[PDB]
Amino acid sequence: RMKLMIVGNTGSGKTTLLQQLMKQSATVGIDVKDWPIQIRDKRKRDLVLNVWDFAGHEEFYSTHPHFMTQRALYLAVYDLSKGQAEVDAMKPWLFNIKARASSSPVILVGTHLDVSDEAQRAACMSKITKELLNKRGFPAIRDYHFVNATEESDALAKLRKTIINESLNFKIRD
Amino acid sequence: MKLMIVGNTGSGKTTLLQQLMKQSATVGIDVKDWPIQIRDKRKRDLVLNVWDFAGHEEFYSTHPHFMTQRALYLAVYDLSKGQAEVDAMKPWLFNIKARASSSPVILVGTHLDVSDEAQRAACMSKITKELLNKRGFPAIRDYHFVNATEESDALAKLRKTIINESLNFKIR
């Protein structure tokens, strides 16, 4: 019922982190794919169709705006190895998340710990504490983590625990 | 523009789309369930519906404005199970109207190849009598009967209809 949204910029490690974190029906519930189409009549290059394939009633129902905006926990992912600019790049994401719901909980995750310098990590921690944590106008940043997203580790296990706890505690206001 | 494919499970939605379809290295939006066995504050079964977004543009496309305004609907049903399945489209139509009040709908009966002419006749009669041009239902701008598992002239005409109505929706 609760949704875990994984957001961030491309190549930051979202899909890799989820695969590692995750380490019922016969079909997928919602399949989203792009369908490019060429037009017989020129002078009008068609866009592509963004196709949403729903398995049934329950899956369509789960995409009602109320669930999409008010029953979602966010993982905001960034690449530590590109430095403090990547924390800067999380600000437009937080503003966007806040606009969906004022009460959206967010867990910040920096990936690529294994190829990040100590200077980049300290710079990112300082930026998060100084500019992102408990700011009115941002979502509630419940926690923040630094992981190598490609392997198991104590740091990844604690992130799993944080996701479980925030989901269980979602029925609460901070 | 979004194409929303709705219907009940087993009606042929995925098969139909694969046949209809005959730019990024990764999927734009990946949705999957993650069941977690828990022992944190109790012990039940926690299933999270995970939405993995590629980037800003994919997240932007799920704004409630776009999920509900810029969408064209395929309402799919298994013609081989009889006019009961046309009846089952009514709750879908009411849901589409509530969700996307100006969105057009194309009705697609699949399993033509294993349907009899009695079921197809009963189905079109119920469509024309009970579904088309009703206030409270979306606009049904076309209806089709196909074998969704292979190419055919009927499937090609459905494909052209989907393309033309997507282009005309953006215009109107």
Ligand SMILES: Nc1nc2c(ncn2[C@@H]2O[C@H](COP(=O)(O)OP(=O)(O)O)[C@@H](O)[C@H]2O)c(=O)[nH]1
């Ligand atoms: N060394 C290292 N590579 C990572 C890490 N996380 C992701 N990657 C790599 O970054 C690249 C992009 O990963 P991907 O999950 O596709 O990013 P997405 O576009 O955000 O979903 C892949 O080569 C991944 O193996 C990490 O923690 N450490």
Ligand SMILES: Nc1nc2c(ncn2[C@@H]2O[C@H](COP(=O)(O)OP(=O)(O)O)[C@@H](O)[C@H]2O)c(=O)[nH]1
């Ligand atoms: N004989 C026949 N089988 C179909 C047709 N359309 C779908 N199927 C079959 O119905 C079953 C369910 O298909 P699927 O696409 O998974 O349905 P979905 O749950 O609505 O996505 C598959 O075995 C398909 O091969 C059709 O037009 N004719």
Ligand SMILES: [Mg+2]
């Ligand atoms: Mg990805």
Ligand SMILES: [Mg+2]
């Ligand atoms: Mg399917």
